[PDB]
Amino acid sequence: DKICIGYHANNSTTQVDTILEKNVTVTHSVELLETQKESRFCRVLNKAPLDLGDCTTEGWILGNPRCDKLLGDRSWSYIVERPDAQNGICYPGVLKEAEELKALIGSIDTIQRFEMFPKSTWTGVDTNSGVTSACTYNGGSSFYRNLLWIIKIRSDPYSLIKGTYTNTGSQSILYFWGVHHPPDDVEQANLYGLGTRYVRMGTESMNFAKGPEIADRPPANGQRGRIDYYWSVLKPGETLNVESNGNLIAPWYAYKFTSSRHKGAIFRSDLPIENCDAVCQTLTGAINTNKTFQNVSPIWIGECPKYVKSKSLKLATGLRNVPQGGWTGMVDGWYGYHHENSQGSGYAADKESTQKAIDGITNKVNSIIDKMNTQFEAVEHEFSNLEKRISNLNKRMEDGFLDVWTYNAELLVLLENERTLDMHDANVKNLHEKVKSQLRDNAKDLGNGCFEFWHKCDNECINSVKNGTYNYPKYQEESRLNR
Amino acid sequence: DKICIGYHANNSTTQVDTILEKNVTVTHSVELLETQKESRFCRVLNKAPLDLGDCTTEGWILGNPRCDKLLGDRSWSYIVERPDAQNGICYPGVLKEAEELKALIGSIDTIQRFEMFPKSTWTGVDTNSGVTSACTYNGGSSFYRNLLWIIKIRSDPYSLIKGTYTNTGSQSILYFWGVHHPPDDVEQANLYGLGTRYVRMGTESMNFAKGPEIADRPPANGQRGRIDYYWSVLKPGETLNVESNGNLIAPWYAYKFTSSRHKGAIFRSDLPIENCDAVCQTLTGAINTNKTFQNVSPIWIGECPKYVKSKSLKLATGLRNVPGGWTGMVDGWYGYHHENSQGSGYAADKESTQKAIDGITNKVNSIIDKMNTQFEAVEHEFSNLEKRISNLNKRMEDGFLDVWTYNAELLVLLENERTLDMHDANVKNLHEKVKSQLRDNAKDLGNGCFEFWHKCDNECINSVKNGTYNYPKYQEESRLNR
Amino acid sequence: DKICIGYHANNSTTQVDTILEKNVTVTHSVELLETQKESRFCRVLNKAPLDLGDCTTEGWILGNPRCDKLLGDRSWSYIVERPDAQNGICYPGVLKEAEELKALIGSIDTIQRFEMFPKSTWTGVDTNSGVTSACTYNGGSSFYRNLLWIIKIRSDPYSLIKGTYTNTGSQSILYFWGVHHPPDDVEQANLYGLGTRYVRMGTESMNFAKGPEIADRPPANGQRGRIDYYWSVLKPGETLNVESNGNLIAPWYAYKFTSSRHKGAIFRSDLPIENCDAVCQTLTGAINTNKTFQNVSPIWIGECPKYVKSKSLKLATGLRNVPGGWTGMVDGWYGYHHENSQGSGYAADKESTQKAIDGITNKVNSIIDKMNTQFEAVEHEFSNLEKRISNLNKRMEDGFLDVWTYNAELLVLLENERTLDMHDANVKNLHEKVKSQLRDNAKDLGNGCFEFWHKCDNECINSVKNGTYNYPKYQEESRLNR
């Protein structure tokens, strides 16, 4: 007659790693890391991204006339700019603080386009001839739809021109202007006139006054001229005054805007936009998961799991799987017993110790999930060629946190896996010892997990062991004789 | 006759969490997190903060004439600027590199105000008419006390004016100037004259040259004109030359200054300043604590504990409290209860109790030691055209806060489990040392206790507690009882 | 007749710390921290550093004529600038975006110097008199070799001058120019002429247009004038046009360059450059190590271990050294000592010893693996008006240093405790496997050892070591002894 102590086994081939041992097969486990994504852009909080098509952010927002599909009021959860977009700043020059403009635009939610200064505002000049072969529309010469290239009437001198606009709404207004710099005095004279020329812009809180910086430069997009483009934000209540006697590229249309309550982004990607929804939308695709880590992309909007470099984060929940060892036959629970007597034989799990282990492991998993429920958020702000130091500072920082979090996740998994599997060993040992202490020398150890009884142990003697009430003196005499 | 093994219990209702289970009552514990603060500003290393009252940093340092309460030499451990302060830049315009000025000012310790360029410096011009209704003093038109608004004499043209000052001391000098921009050419002509006009400032190591940017703008504080305000630092030994033919807002008074040996700050707060001292002074109050973490504020000066988001960080030191345990023990953590003809009673095991005390004390101190650094957030400001670096600073500050909060919270959960396990193992060790000695001269009982198969006197029992029992002495007597 | 269970000891005096106790002597250990370096600068990936000697980066790259040792084509893995270097910007003035130039230069690996605009490009002007006593060569007045200081011929007016250059190669070109600002109108007229004067530079992607900002400034290096120096990069395909009627300091020679595929650096150090190679080269010396941590310097190029503040990171691999343990074992970590009629001796248990070796080895390697990443501090410079970003870079660098130092030091304390506990458990397991087998045909002794109640030959003893003993064979012979 005998009783054994053992633990669950099954057909699982899933492995985990621990601090002491690699490739350890276990009976149950949980993958904390999400590796899958749909390669496309979906709506976030039911709001669609804005696809810039063949236009850059600058082409869109300045109104490059190849970008008419985008013209007007828009709203978006994020922006998708195609890497090979060809329609941007078509008449050559520089946009001042371009990178800060993009950061502004990535924080915006909705825009309403409106005519800020109609052509009629500018008297004694030609407002209908400011076009260039650099900015074509259907083969023809054209120009930015948000800017007005004013020139002199051929017969007449360029009049002093003035315009004013007041922001009487509760929304800020994003607007644009520029200063044109011809390549030589002949062209200056033709378009504006000789002498001192100025472009002046004034607000309660910004002042601007500049002139042509004439110089012959190599042609870009077929032009030897250049424009310095500027942008600004006219705050609620503020008023703008414009004066010029030449070289003004005037604001024409502008944008009343709202700032998002949510983090937005400009993604530079060729991925398709489709009719779908995502809780989590990364730069390289949408993720639908309830896992807490993710190795898809560090750049996203919505609610995403923490990004890490790991390929897997497999957390052991069950036991070492060692069949012949463990008992494939148990099935009821994690730890338990196998008995053999005259009434028969069989397996039966110990409910108490099994549940305690379930409760602890469950709590461990949830605690890890809970404590890992924050994300470091990388951002795709841009930096100019004269901003290498801050660009490098941003990169080292983002890689810095990535390395810390990847380390924290991987190390924790290795260490707690070892603990979890040790806890199981200890739980099994505990049951075996409780049986040991009870039977004393009315049974033989066998160094096996099992005990050979020195007496007959019926189905009530055996259940007397499972509830921990055995009674040694009852079989003491019977046992001592067999020797 | 019997001997038992047990562990301490008490009346404690303090709970801790562990990785495996929550709300576990324990006998002793230590809160690592400080949550309390006095809602005020105190002295730090015995130096008081400077209260700017109804002035902004800029109103103060430019010498807005409503800020005379601050005028002159001052010294401070930190600066307190009130959120509603009304006296700042009164004549409209921008201070260039305003945010970098503030960072500088937060790093300064003491200033001494002095006349850098007296009015007599500027010949052939009017130095006594440069006042405005935008900057009022006692119902009158006035102007910044540290700047001089020079205009042309009506009858005469604005002479080329020159002035020079040499820093012959060992302290750097913080000084200010500006360029005035009238709204139109009429005003430009009246005050300065037409033609190209410049303001040029030169040092051994910096040059500045700028002109009027004339533009008709909406009024601000009743003025259509603007000033671009500038600041700079004249180093020891250096000389400043000033040259202008118009539009100059000249430095008048300036500040010799010392840089602090300590970290300083500008706090934007309404909290009161009081007669008190603080080792640790945060933006939302003073902390007096020997704890190593703190959830009050990430911004401070002095020596403060590490900031974390946690509401609590309770580290178990004692045992699971299950009164099970013996409320009767009291002497120590682990021990014995005996019963014989001479009587009964509890007595702690000194050796194993002290070893546990030493380990737990060492663990606490080790954690304290390794957590004795702080990440320091700063309240530097960023302009509207510095959103990228501002966001970079924010993500970084939140980034370290999240790593430290994680490290602290997880460590507490994990070590709480280990600490309570260690206690279990220690109790079992004692019980086994007794088992091994008595063999079959006592019965286990599966109880923690042992029923002796013989009589065990107060010397037999103390023979167990020191680990020298002698089995053969009672071997016969024990085997007879069956 | 007896059998004992014990563990290895030796003469080791090496100590480690754990979370529960300090200064614990152990039998084997490994130091994870590298503290040694060679105090010199070596080649990295086969390429030598460039030693700037008595020149600053700027003196070199502008071609200060006292820097002819450096003149022409050069290549380097990193740059070494000496702290007391004197030959820099000799004619006083400011280099615009100087700090960003240095970052660029640190990222470059080869340059080829070439004449971009020969003197003949500028007609109707004096190209052979642009020298100053501020920039001496062999006692004589001279000038930067990469710039050309053009002045008017005395008899003639300064002609409009033009030049153009097109980059027809695949490499970018780094070039320089400047605008001269004389101290007064007399000198302006003498050198260039009166009236409006301009310096215009144009590319497909950049435009520049500026004039003299005339002002009398204190003399620096004997000069009241100044030059604003500029730099830029002409990309492959681009063409540069230059137009001026005065005040132009023209590019003369420039540098075609390649960008390194590897991180480079400018080290400010007096350490000697020698004939050696380093995998890892830090600012304070070369490191050759296989260790994973390092407390030498946070600034480096090449492949270096992670920087931390620690003085030591000693990881226990072996046992607590208590000679207790058996100095006599030597064969392994855990094992047996037997005594019978055939003799006596020690013998390690191979199975349990190997399992422990495998786990500890795996632990060490896992730690090494997970610590195989480095945060890299950089020595970019920041101007006086960049205190905020400079402080941001510093707090960030110190932030990660503190996190990694903590992670390393805490991990070592915690795993040391686990490692030493694992050994205790392994020994106990063996002792119990022998207890269970012999039952009461041996006496425990409470000692680690077992006195056999019978004769146990060299086959009886090996019958214990493989776990197959057979109690009934000797059971009777036991019960006799009573």
Ligand SMILES: *[C@@H]1O[C@H](CO)[C@@H](O[C@@H]2O[C@H](CO)[C@@H](O)[C@H](O)[C@H]2NC(C)=O)[C@H](O)[C@H]1NC(C)=O
């Ligand atoms: C995130 O990790 C997964 C694997 O755990 C990576 O996906 C595997 O990539 C390899 C090589 O690219 C393929 O052969 C496997 O079939 C992929 N596995 C799965 C589940 O897709 C994935 O590359 C990781 N993401 C990134 C950006 O590296």
Ligand SMILES: *[C@@H]1O[C@H](CO)[C@@H](O[C@@H]2O[C@H](CO)[C@@H](O)[C@H](O)[C@H]2NC(C)=O)[C@H](O)[C@H]1NC(C)=O
């Ligand atoms: C400061 O912390 C120390 C330990 O970090 C605390 O010291 C204990 O304080 C109580 C009395 O308040 C004593 O009974 C203990 O004996 C002290 N422990 C040790 C190890 O010395 C102290 O309480 C803390 N101070 C405050 C104000 O909370």
Ligand SMILES: *[C@@H]1O[C@H](CO)[C@@H](O[C@@H]2O[C@H](CO)[C@@H](O)[C@H](O)[C@H]2NC(C)=O)[C@H](O)[C@H]1NC(C)=O
């Ligand atoms: C890194 O730590 C090492 C070793 O702990 C330091 O080198 C020791 O310096 C101390 C104090 O000057 C001396 O007791 C020993 O002579 C040194 N020991 C060894 C092994 O070198 C070293 O200073 C540290 N490095 C830095 C940059 O602080």
Ligand SMILES: *[C@@H]1O[C@H](CO)[C@@H](O)[C@H](O)[C@H]1NC(C)=O
């Ligand atoms: C609980 O008991 C002791 C004395 O029996 C007492 O001194 C102690 O203060 C009590 N608990 C608390 C929280 O005060």
Ligand SMILES: *[C@@H]1O[C@H](CO)[C@@H](O)[C@H](O)[C@H]1NC(C)=O
């Ligand atoms: C633990 O106790 C707190 C109150 O002290 C309670 O809010 C919480 O629900 C409890 N949690 C569990 C799991 O018992």
Ligand SMILES: *[C@@H]1O[C@H](CO)[C@@H](O)[C@H](O)[C@H]1NC(C)=O
């Ligand atoms: C921690 O500080 C917060 C301030 O954020 C405070 O409101 C809270 O009460 C603190 N935690 C506890 C347990 O008091």
Ligand SMILES: *[C@H]1O[C@H](CO)[C@@H](O)[C@H](O)[C@H]1NC(C)=O
């Ligand atoms: C996964 O689903 C559970 C529902 O029990 C939810 O509470 C948890 O937050 C989900 N995961 C994530 C990452 O939000």
Ligand SMILES: *[C@H]1O[C@H](CO)[C@@H](O)[C@H](O)[C@H]1NC(C)=O
């Ligand atoms: C251990 O402790 C003492 C101070 O308590 C110290 O002086 C000694 O040098 C330490 N030993 C080692 C090896 O660190």
